[PDB]
Paper text:
The FL spikes, expressed and purified from insect cells, were formulated in 0.01% (v/v) polysorbate 80 (PS 80) detergent. We next performed single-particle cryo–electron microscopy (cryo-EM) on the spike formulated in PS 80 detergent. Our final atomic model contains residues 14 to 1146 with breaks only in the flexible loop (619 to 631) and the cleavage site (678 to 688). The S1 NTD rotated ~14° relative to published models, whereas the CTD and subdomains showed minor local rearrangements. In our 3Q-2P-FL structure, we observed a shift in residues flanking the 615 to 635 loop, resulting in a salt bridge between residue D614 on one protomer and K854 on a neighboring protomer. This observation is particularly notable given the increased prevalence of D614→G (D614G) mutation in the emerging SARS-CoV-2 strains and its potential role in viral transmission and pathogenesis. The first density was buried within a hydrophobic pocket of the CTD. The main chain carboxyl group of linoleic acid interacts with the R408 and Q409 residues of the RBD from the adjacent protomer, potentially stabilizing the observed RBD-down state and consistent with a recent report. The location of the PS 80 ligand provides a possible explanation for the S1 shift seen in our FL trimer density. PS 80 is specific to the formulation of the Novavax 3Q-2P-FL immunogen, but other ligands may also bind this pocket and provide a potential target for drug design against SARS-CoV-2.
Numbering used by the authors:
A (entry chain A): 1030 to 1146
B (entry chain A): 295 to 618, 632 to 677, 689 to 735
C (entry chain C): 736 to 1078
D (entry chain B): 736 to 784
The structure:
């Protein structure tokens, strides 16, 4: 019921990896399952920070992590690298730059002001 | 050990694996027999050859002590029509010591011999002589028709005919108080409904067998739970310490290793007992030392077997030895000591691998080329790895694989009836 | 069980009679062997979920968090953590090392030492396949895994992440914005460190929490001591001692008395095996649950309300103990509520 | 279970014989007692949360 009729989120159910789907097959005196899982691959190490300091306000990723290469900061989802420009749509604003430990300085892009200009 | 595995499994083929077998055992090498050094022969000439016997009315009870019960001395001339042992098989009488030995002795009518046995009823069993339900001795009797008989009758033998109740085991009553019958008060005078309780026997030489006199001797005794001074004719030997031996201590037999003990028995205690009532100590009958007795067998063995369809080499693990003579079946050139025991026959290597044929306590084994042998090794735990954990570094996947794995779960059993 | 030693230890006449009633002796051992194997499988299923034995990182800058009582203590010859050391010291095993030499029992002492008394009657104890040191290496790997990689140390190759970020994501999992963790990072680290210190002192002071592991040990010890004590029963025989029977009776009479004792002794052994087998089913169920909790509380973040302790599950760390696993479950519990108007 | 009553209820001769075969009578009750305790624990675990 939990692997075939639905999608289990239990880490040790339906095989190793993130459960994606499954298909039952019968056998004498029992059941054999084919469990389809998703396993991440080919990771790379990037620089990271818990928040970005813009104008003194602290910006936290709405989802994902703030990650960077040697020249630019991007926001990505956790399980598959896909850098996106950090904009005001992808972030929460709270607190300030004097509170978050490890905060870094990186301009956050305003998607609307340039259209209005 | 490999053959032991094959017999246990009822097979001529054994799959690779670990099999358990019987605990390591050794055999006894010699037999120790110890009895007190008694030189006097028991009074067979007084018990069975008396000029006069007591009547069943007032039977005698002779105490026997400090003698050798060599009853073969009776074979040259005694003849016993009746003989039965209750507490011991008669074939064991010569390997045992007896204690608290008493010989009851009396004369009865031949048809009454059958009433002596425990559980019987009748005028003797109920009013003159009764054995207990759990009697542990021997009853012997013979036809003295030329000793206790007289031409005009032998009126010196009496039995009790009247009593108001039955006797309890081994009681005597020699009272002549006149018996009152029929609820008819009687002031000590024979008469209507008043009887002298005792009657005589005839025992004429011309009577048929049921009326001939018989001499009965009952030998009452106890076995194996006390010091004993009456003992059979088996010869003693010297005592050997600290070896696996067979033994006989005053009739108590068994095997084990005899060692000196710090236990101190009270003057009346001959044997000790452990927690499960097994003798674990004895007092030697000639020199009063207390000896402990331990079992000869001890240990535990298992056999490491490559499949027999591949190789006949095995390694044997002994759980109770240090190996640094040894309680092993054999000693080879390859001896490895681990927490799980002493492993003999497997080579040891300093490598580590995935486990097969598990031994225990960190050790596994396998059959390998380099010309092949059994190898003992420690287990690996997968392989070592590490992470960087820089406090500002994150790893993020850039690709993925979708994989499919299987899992098997039994659902049902064969239904039976 | 050496089912011959228990019945006819050192007795030839008994041993030969026992051959006819021999299929039963073999069957008892087959059941016990199956149990013995299952017990190593249970240990492996609970702890051996990691094939990559990760070393404790050289960098201890896990934000403001401590964890030194949880991680292996390098000053010891063992790889036990401080908390594990306490757990191992409180659960009492009857003995250790599994070796008693014959010479060690060659005296009066054999009757006082219950383990020796069990061995002389054919009852033995087998060592576990994994040792305490190996288990400590497995718990070490699990901790290195969750301290540095968290969720992804399993279900794929381990990825590193800063510790504070790892918890930030666990807070989003609960349903609390990540902003709380960063703004209150010092408070959170201090509460965590204090909680661990309280556990350490609690375990040092009161051992009753560990009664469950002590009970497993005591129950098996009692079952074996019971088998020795039951040897004294007569079972309808004249005497419980084979030597008394054999000394006083001839073969055909002795055979009756011996057969009564043999049947009775098998009855005791069958009772023992059945009880061990039922208990084995119970320990397996516990082991399966333990394995599930290991994977769902340590290798991931369970959202089941009654798993990983009370409160919202945030993270957990396993520790080993004799015959079992002890978990430290870290949960988030809300506090100091106020009532507001709502719509 | 009163394992004496079940075997030798109101009988002296039987009761005394039963003493030799006595470790078994005790063992049965120990198992039943353990079950009886577990049954209250089960009730408490399900409802007393
Ligand atoms: C992450 O960066 C490190 C370098 O900072 C890469 O190299 C390994 O770093 C670890 C940790 O110090 C060492 O133990 C290894 O020996 C280094 N590898 C080699 C070949 O020297 C590491 O590979 C990077 N991670 C990823 C996914 O690329
Ligand atoms: C970090 O990623 C950015 C985005 O992909 C890279 O920036 C671009 O690099 C290409 C050359 O490969 C240029 O033609 C583009 O104009 C750059 N874009 C911007 C906005 O500058 C950047 O080079 C990467 N940095 C490093 C150190 O690898
Ligand atoms: C991550 O660790 C590094 C050290 O490995 C920390 O670097 C320090 O940064 C401060 C400025 O904030 C400097 O004054 C110190 O001199 C640096 N230390 C060293 C040894 O160079 C860094 O701050 C840490 N970051 C976080 C978020 O914890
Ligand atoms: C982000 O930029 C601000 C400046 O806008 C940096 O703050 C200055 O830091 C220097 C060196 O410590 C001080 O002398 C100045 O007085 C600070 N200025 C202000 C307005 O606070 C800040 O350190 C930068 N942050 C990061 C993470 O790089
Ligand atoms: C009981 O008495 C008889 C005699 O009535 C003993 O038997 C005699 O023993 C001597 C010496 O060995 C022989 O010369 C006689 O021939 C035997 N007589 C008969 C009739 O056989 C007998 O030994 C005595 N028994 C015991 C135990 O002392
Ligand atoms: C042991 O002595 C007692 C007391 O004399 C006997 O019991 C009595 O027996 C007479 C009949 O002979 C009865 O009238 C009395 O009422 C009994 N008294 C009691 C207290 O029970 C007893 O029978 C004797 N035991 C044996 C084996 O003879
Ligand atoms: C086999 O016996 C030896 C002793 O003869 C044990 O080795 C000793 O272990 C103690 C610690 O318990 C050390 O202090 C001694 O120095 C060791 N002595 C020697 C000669 O090595 C050894 O542990 C026993 N084997 C097993 C598997 O227990
Ligand atoms: C983790 O807590 C331990 C205490 O349980 C800290 O170790 C103590 O450090 C002080 C100095 O500040 C010493 O005087 C004590 O003797 C140490 N005690 C022990 C048992 O080692 C340890 O430094 C803390 N670690 C972190 C990262 O906070
Ligand atoms: C939340 O509660 C904690 C305590 O549970 C508060 O932290 C304590 O504050 C007092 C001062 O009032 C200090 O003396 C303690 O040392 C602090 N404890 C810790 C672990 O740091 C905290 O200030 C409260 N926060 C809010 C927003 O009410
Ligand atoms: C919620 O508001 C109530 C008042 O409306 C607070 O006071 C309690 O209200 C309950 C419900 O009527 C009573 O049973 C209690 O006796 C009241 N408490 C006292 C001390 O009189 C209540 O405390 C408020 N909740 C919170 C979290 O502040
Ligand atoms: C005809 C009688 C009524 C039948 C009913 C059953 C009665 C049971 C009694 C049987 C008689 C037992 C006599 C035992 C011999 C005694 C001889 C002796 O000691 O000298
Ligand atoms: C004879 O008996 C005494 C007393 O029990 C004993 O001390 C002595 O050793 C025995 N002797 C032998 C067989 O010479």
């Amino acid at each position: 019921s939990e692997c075939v009729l639905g999608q289990s989120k239990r880490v040790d159910f339906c095989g190793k990896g993130y459960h994606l789907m499954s298909f039952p097959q019968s056998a004498p005196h029992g059941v054999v399952f084919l469990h389809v899982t998703y396993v991440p691959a080919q990771e790379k190490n990037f620089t990271t920070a818990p928040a970005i300091c813009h104008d003194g306000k602290a910006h936290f990723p709405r989802e994902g992590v703030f990650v960077s290469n040697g020249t630019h900061w991007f926001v990505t989802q956790r399980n598959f690298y896909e850098p996106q420009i950090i904009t005001t749509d992808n972030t929460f604003v709270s607190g300030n730059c004097d509170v978050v430990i490890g905060i870094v300085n990186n301009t956050v892009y305003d998607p609307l002001q340039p259209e209005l200009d | 050990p490999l053959s032991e595995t094959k017999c246990t499994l009822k097979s001529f083929t054994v799959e690779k694996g670990i099999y358990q077998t019987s605990n390591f055992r050794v055999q006894p090498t010699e037999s120790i027999v110890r009895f007190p050094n008694i030189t006097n022969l028991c009074p067979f000439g007084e018990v069975f050859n008396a000029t006069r016997f007591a009547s069943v009315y007032a039977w005698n009870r002779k105490r026997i002590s400090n003698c050798v019960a060599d009853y073969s001395v009776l074979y040259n001339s005694a003849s016993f029509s009746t003989f039965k042992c209750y507490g011991v098989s008669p074939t064991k009488l010569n390997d045992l010591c007896f204690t608290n030995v008493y010989a009851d002795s009396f004369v009865i009518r031949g048809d009454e011999v059958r009433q002596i046995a425990p559980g019987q009823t009748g005028k003797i069993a109920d009013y003159n002589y009764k054995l207990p339900d759990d009697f542990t001795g021997c009853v012997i009797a013979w036809n003295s028709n030329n000793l206790d008989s007289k031409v005009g009758g032998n009126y010196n033998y009496l039995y009790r005919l009247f009593r108001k109740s039955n006797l309890k085991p081994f009681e005597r009553d020699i009272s002549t108080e006149i018996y009152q019958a029929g609820s008819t008060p009687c002031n000590g005078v024979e008469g209507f409904n008043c009887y002298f309780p005792l009657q005589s026997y005839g025992f004429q030489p011309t009577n048929g067998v049921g009326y001939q006199p018989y001499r009965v001797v009952v030998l009452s005794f106890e076995l194996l739970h006390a010091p004993a001074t009456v003992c059979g004719p088996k010869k003693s030997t010297n005592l050997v310490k600290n070896k696996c031996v067979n033994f006989n201590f005053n009739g108590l037999t068994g095997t084990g290793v005899l060692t000196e003990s710090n236990k101190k028995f009270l003057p009346f205690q001959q044997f000790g007992r452990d927690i499960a009532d097994t003798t674990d100590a004895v007092r030697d009958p000639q020199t009063l030392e207390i000896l402990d007795i331990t079992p000869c067998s001890f240990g535990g063995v298992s056999v490491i077997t490559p499949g027999t369809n591949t190789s006949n080499q095995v390694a044997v693990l002994y759980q109770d030895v240090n190996c640094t003579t040894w309680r092993v079946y054999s000693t080879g050139s390859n001896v490895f000591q681990t927490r799980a025991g002493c492993l003999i026959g497997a080579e040891h290597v300093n490598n580590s691998y995935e486990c097969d044929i598990p031994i225990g306590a960190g050790i596994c084994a396998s059959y390998q080329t380099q010309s092949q042998s059994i190898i003992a090794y420690t287990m690996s735990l997968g392989a070592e790895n590490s992470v960087a954990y820089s406090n500002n570094s994150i790893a993020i996947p850039t690709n993925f694989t979708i994989s499919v794995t299987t899992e098997i779960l039994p659902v049902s059993m064969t239904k039976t009836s | 069980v050496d089912c011959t030693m228990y019945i006819c230890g050192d007795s030839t006449e008994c041993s030969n009679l026992l051959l006819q009633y021999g299929s039963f002796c073999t069957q008892l051992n087959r059941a016990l062997t199956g149990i013995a194997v299952e017990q190593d499988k249970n240990t492996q299923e609970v702890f051996a979920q990691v094939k990559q034995i990760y070393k404790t990182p050289p960098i201890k800058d896990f934000g403001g968090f401590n964890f030194s009582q949880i991680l292996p203590d390098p000053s010891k010859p063992s790889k036990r953590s401080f908390i594990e050391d306490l757990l191992f010291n409180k659960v009492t095993l009857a003995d250790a090392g599994f070796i008693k030499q014959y010479g060690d029992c060659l005296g009066d002492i054999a009757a006082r030492d219950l383990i020796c008394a069990q061995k002389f009657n054919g009852l033995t104890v087998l060592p576990p396949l994994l040792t305490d040191e190996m288990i400590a290496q497995y718990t070490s790997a699990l901790l290195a895994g969750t301290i540095t990689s968290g969720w992804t140390f399993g279900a794929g190759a381990a990825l590193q992440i800063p510790f504070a970020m790892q918890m930030a994501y666990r807070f989003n999992g609960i349903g609390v914005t990540q902003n709380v963790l960063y703004e209150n990072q010092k408070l959170i680290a201090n509460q965590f460190n204090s909680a661990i210190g309280k556990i350490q002192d609690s375990l040092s002071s009161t051992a009753s929490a560990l009664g469950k592991l002590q009970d497993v040990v005591n129950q098996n010890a009692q079952a074996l001591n019971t088998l020795v004590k039951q040897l004294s029963s007569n079972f309808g025989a004249i005497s419980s001692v084979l030597n008394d029977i054999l000394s006083r009776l001839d073969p055909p009479e002795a055979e009756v008395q011996i057969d009564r004792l043999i049947t009775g002794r098998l009855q005791s052994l069958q009772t023992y095996v059945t009880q061990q087998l039922i208990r084995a089913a119970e320990i397996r169920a516990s082991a399966n649950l333990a394995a599930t909790k290991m994977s769902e509380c340590v290798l991931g973040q369970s959202k089941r309300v009654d798993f990983c302790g009370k409160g919202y599950h945030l993270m957990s760390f396993p520790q080993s103990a004799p015959h079992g696993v002890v978990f430290l479950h870290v949960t988030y519990v809300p506090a100091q509520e106020k009532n507001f108007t709502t719509a």
